[PDB]
Scaffold this motif. Structure first.
Motif, PDB file in Angstrom:
ATOM      1  N   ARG A   1       0.832  -1.195   0.000  1.00  0.00           N
ATOM      2  CA  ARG A   1       0.000   0.000   0.000  1.00  0.00           C
ATOM      3  C   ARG A   1       0.872   1.252   0.000  1.00  0.00           C
ATOM      4  O   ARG A   1       1.732   1.402   0.878  1.00  0.00           O
ATOM      5  N   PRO A   2       0.688   2.164  -0.955  1.00  0.00           N
ATOM      6  CA  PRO A   2       1.489   3.397  -0.954  1.00  0.00           C
ATOM      7  C   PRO A   2       1.169   4.332   0.197  1.00  0.00           C
ATOM      8  O   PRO A   2       1.932   5.273   0.446  1.00  0.00           O
ATOM      9  N   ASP A   3       0.054   4.125   0.891  1.00  0.00           N
ATOM     10  CA  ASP A   3      -0.368   5.008   1.968  1.00  0.00           C
ATOM     11  C   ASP A   3      -0.250   4.375   3.344  1.00  0.00           C
ATOM     12  O   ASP A   3      -0.600   5.016   4.338  1.00  0.00           O
ATOM     13  N   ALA A   4       0.214   3.135   3.431  1.00  0.00           N
ATOM     14  CA  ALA A   4       0.157   2.412   4.691  1.00  0.00           C
ATOM     15  C   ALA A   4       1.151   2.969   5.700  1.00  0.00           C
ATOM     16  O   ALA A   4       2.237   3.435   5.349  1.00  0.00           O
ATOM     17  N   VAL A   5       0.765   2.906   6.970  1.00  0.00           N
ATOM     18  CA  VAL A   5       1.629   3.266   8.085  1.00  0.00           C
ATOM     19  C   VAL A   5       2.149   1.973   8.692  1.00  0.00           C
ATOM     20  O   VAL A   5       1.379   1.189   9.260  1.00  0.00           O
ATOM     21  N   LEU A   6       3.454   1.749   8.573  1.00  0.00           N
ATOM     22  CA  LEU A   6       4.093   0.530   9.045  1.00  0.00           C
ATOM     23  C   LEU A   6       4.909   0.841  10.289  1.00  0.00           C
ATOM     24  O   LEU A   6       5.626   1.845  10.331  1.00  0.00           O
ATOM     25  N   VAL A   7       4.792  -0.013  11.298  1.00  0.00           N
ATOM     26  CA  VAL A   7       5.511   0.148  12.554  1.00  0.00           C
ATOM     27  C   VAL A   7       6.445  -1.039  12.736  1.00  0.00           C
ATOM     28  O   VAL A   7       6.072  -2.184  12.456  1.00  0.00           O
ATOM     29  N   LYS A   8       7.667  -0.766  13.182  1.00  0.00           N
ATOM     30  CA  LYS A   8       8.670  -1.796  13.392  1.00  0.00           C
ATOM     31  C   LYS A   8       9.359  -1.592  14.733  1.00  0.00           C
ATOM     32  O   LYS A   8       9.400  -0.481  15.268  1.00  0.00           O
ATOM     33  N   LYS A   9       9.892  -2.685  15.276  1.00  0.00           N
ATOM     34  CA  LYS A   9      10.609  -2.612  16.538  1.00  0.00           C
ATOM     35  C   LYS A   9      11.974  -1.952  16.333  1.00  0.00           C
ATOM     36  O   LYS A   9      12.532  -1.993  15.233  1.00  0.00           O
ATOM     37  N   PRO A  10      12.526  -1.322  17.375  1.00  0.00           N
ATOM     38  CA  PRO A  10      13.750  -0.522  17.184  1.00  0.00           C
ATOM     39  C   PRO A  10      14.941  -1.301  16.658  1.00  0.00           C
ATOM     40  O   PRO A  10      15.486  -0.951  15.604  1.00  0.00           O
ATOM     41  N   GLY A  11      15.363  -2.353  17.355  1.00  0.00           N
ATOM     42  CA  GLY A  11      16.604  -3.031  17.043  1.00  0.00           C
ATOM     43  C   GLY A  11      16.552  -4.044  15.925  1.00  0.00           C
ATOM     44  O   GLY A  11      17.537  -4.769  15.724  1.00  0.00           O
TER      45      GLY A  11
END
Lengths: 269, 49, 204, 49, 204, 49, 80
Positions: D23-33
């Motif tokens: 998705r060009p509009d998606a908000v993706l969250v990832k863990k720091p390390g």
């Protein structure tokens, strides 16, 4: 010439077009009338393999007429016309005309339209000493008139101007098809590229933003002020070279449309 | 009537294809589902034609 | 609902803390939780008219953290900052003309003002925040997310000096756990338990 | 479509990630390390063209 | 099913811990496990009608963590956030007109709302999470994945100060192992035991 | 009168489209909503025509 | 029809002043004096009539009426 030009224009867009040359009796001065019939309003036998159209056993011409005109057209059977299928094309046109609007308060006075189907069929004869054409006009529930073709020529008035004809099923198709699917691909590419330009894709550290709703709303706005946590990285503009890639893909599809006079010669023949 | 029904149901695929071709000719090139998809994006559908 | 369900975790890590101090720490940790998570929600209906800066009504053991959505007599209203009105709409304060309400501005802490004043029903759809002195926390905080608020309260309690309960290592560990759990739950407003996707708005 | 090579714990919910990467509009969250490498292979598109 | 199968590992690494504390740590560790692994699934059915914010009925020793999908009279239903409805579909709450359901929103913690209200059967297929006070853990948590929950619980116990159990080294070590095991099992929802491939949805 | 009403409301969509086309011809190409949006932006709308 | 003979009717709504409309058709001036349409022509006429958003219209005002010319086709079935 205008009728022939329109007919070939339709043979370009769609599989085939029909031009009819017949003799009609009315107060109209010209006895021999040559008029165009759209590909929508003609149903032709598909079992024919001859290029001439001799093997075409029967031709059906569904026409939509007003009740006054239809009753004036053929006498002695006005009651059946008063008391009175089709493909989605002509039915859709007629029903769109009848619908007017989605929700409309139609008055008492409504124009009434009836469907008359004119059929020309060929039956073997084998005179002792072979194919005799007979005209058949019938409504939905009855036939108005049945008789043989008065014309000496033993072929139907409607002559089909062919085009690209499918090999497997022997049915015509227009120039469009390949241009059609490449065109819809081009439209998809353009829409995808414009979207990618408009909206940013955001991959972030899990604790990047305190308020995710305001962030989500105001990423795209050129005037927005974004508040972020100190050490949680935000990666805006994640995939935007996809814009250039999709633009190049659309340009390449345009070039392929250019590649796909001499090539068109079969339609002219 | 039986012959006309057989002709209509046999030709339905190619008649529908020719209808869609004539429809794409006059700058109507978006499927209703995909047009809705574009609408939810907030993007106005476009046809290059 | 009462905090005595929160008590066993604290007395497991901080053995002998008085119940009032533990209560205060739990309430403050829940304040931080609702500030970051924004899960708690409620609706209220009240009448506003004749240039009245009405105040929101909320459950007694709670305070209005934030207004998710404001509706005037059935209209989804557009919130604006006061400086935004001073720029776009002059004579906001001077005029007394009544008209169809179109923007909301919150001059005070809990009072919402409409630039067109009218006499009509106002429905406020606002996130909630537990007050500093609430005997009973709402069900969602205590029943489902006991451990996170317990971690925050235990960090605060282990901070306290000059006592057998003092332990810097465990205090830091619990603070980091509280931060991480808050951080993971930060997206629950848009997501929820329904896995609703989070998609950026596109501007053309 | 994107191809993703990532550490094991890059994303908390792998289903929302799986759906929203393209998705060009998606908000993706990832863990720091834990690093995320989207677009693992994309010069292959130019190669195939 | 009972926690008496978990507790021997706690005995081995945390000598002679009281059973209620170890059981509470088992519950918290299994809660975190289900939050990360999302492997527990159960199917629930109830009837919803007449603008009722019905709550999902769950087993006594469980809580509805997350809804994999909702089916409404046989319709695969689409979950969206409340703001998405506020911004596309206005008069979401004010309107009372009935219709065939098209969107799901979870305004409360366990209540489901469909943008058209209709009286029909609702089937919720959702992940489950053990409650903070559960006597028996599910079969998947107990029989086959006892060691990971045990490691999490051992971290929790070894954190406890002022006791013979306290050991920071083992606490950190078991925390790391618990995190790594959860991290490996994160993909087991999509893959399962069947080796189902994980493939990004393609958007054109 | 009934015939005139039917012919008017049947061609209402195309009549509006032709009116919009003629309106676009002489350098008015902005929707009132989009013009308001640009006004809030502080930007003077412009048409290239 | 490409020719357009199948066109059953055509309607020409014209906006005329009361004086000129009365002059064009005699013996029925009273009906004109005591005297639908799409957004285009009515929009033009009503934009003319409105002048501005708020104006003090005097007693003297141009009175305009609409006349519709309908050309219709009906079959006759002449025996001949």
């Amino acid at each position: 010439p205008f009728h022939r030009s329109r007919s070939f224009e339709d043979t370009v867009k769609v599989g085939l077009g029909w031009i009819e040359d017949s003799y009609d009796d009315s107060t109209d001065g010209e006895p021999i009338y040559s008029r165009y019939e759209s590909w929508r309003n003609v149903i032709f036998d598909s079992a024919s393999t001859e290029l001439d159209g001799t093997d075409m056993r029967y031709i059906f011409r569904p026409k939509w007429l007003d009740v006054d005109v239809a009753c004036a057209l053929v006498p002695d059977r006005a009651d059946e016309i008063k008391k009175a299928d089709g493909d989605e094309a002509m039915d859709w046109a007629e029903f769109d005309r009848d619908t007017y609007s989605q929700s409309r308060t139609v008055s008492t006075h409504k124009r009434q339209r009836v469907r008359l189907i004119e059929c020309w069929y060929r039956k073997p004869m084998r005179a002792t000493k072979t194919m005799r054409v007979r005209v058949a006009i019938f409504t939905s529930r009855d036939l108005l008139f049945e008789g043989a073709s008065p014309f000496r020529h033993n072929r139907f008035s409607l002559t089909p101007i062919w085009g690209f004809r499918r090999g497997r099923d022997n049915l015509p198709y227009g120039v469009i098809r390949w241009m059609r699917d490449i065109q819809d691909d081009i439209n998809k590419r353009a829409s995808k590229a414009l979207y990618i330009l408009s909206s940013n894709k955001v991959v972030m550290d899990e604790g990047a933003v305190e308020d995710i709703e305001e962030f989500r709303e105001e990423v795209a706005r050129p005037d927005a002020v974004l508040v972020k946590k100190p050490g949680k990285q935000i990666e805006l503009n994640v995939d935007r070279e996809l814009a250039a890639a999709h633009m190049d893909m659309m340009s390449r599809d345009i070039q392929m449309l250019q590649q796909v006079t001499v090539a068109t010669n079969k339609l002219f023949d | 009537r039986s012959y006309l029904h057989q002709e209509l149901d046999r030709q339905a695929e190619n008649r529908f294809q020719m209808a869609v071709d004539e429809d794409y000719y006059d700058s109507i090139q978006w499927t209703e589902a995909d047009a809705q998809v574009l609408k939810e994006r907030g993007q106005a559908p476009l046809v290059f034609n | 609902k009462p905090l005595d369900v929160f008590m066993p975790i604290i007395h497991r890590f901080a053995p002998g803390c008085p119940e009032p101090t533990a209560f205060a720490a739990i309430r403050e940790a829940a304040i931080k939780f609702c500030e970051r998570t924004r899960l708690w929600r409620c609706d209220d209906e009240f009448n506003v008219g004749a240039d009245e800066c009405a105040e929101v009504a909320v459950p007694y053991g709670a305070a209005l953290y934030e207004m998710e959505l404001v509706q005037f007599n059935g209209r989804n209203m557009r919130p604006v900052s006061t400086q935004w009105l001073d720029e776009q709409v002059p004579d906001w304060r001077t005029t007394t003309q009544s008209g169809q309400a179109q923007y909301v501005t919150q001059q005070s802490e809990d009072t919402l003002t409409f630039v067109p004043a009218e006499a009509g029903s106002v429905r406020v759809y606002g996130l909630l925040k537990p007050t500093l002195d609430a005997d009973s926390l709402p069900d969602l905080l205590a029943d489902t997310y006991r451990k996170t608020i317990a971690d925050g309260a235990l960090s605060e309690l282990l901070i306290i000096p000059g006592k057998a309960w003092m332990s810097a290592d465990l205090a830091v560990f619990f603070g980091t756990r509280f931060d991480r759990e808050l951080d993971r739950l930060s997206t629950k407003t848009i997501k929820g338990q329904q896995r609703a996707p989070v998609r950026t708005r596109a501007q053309f």
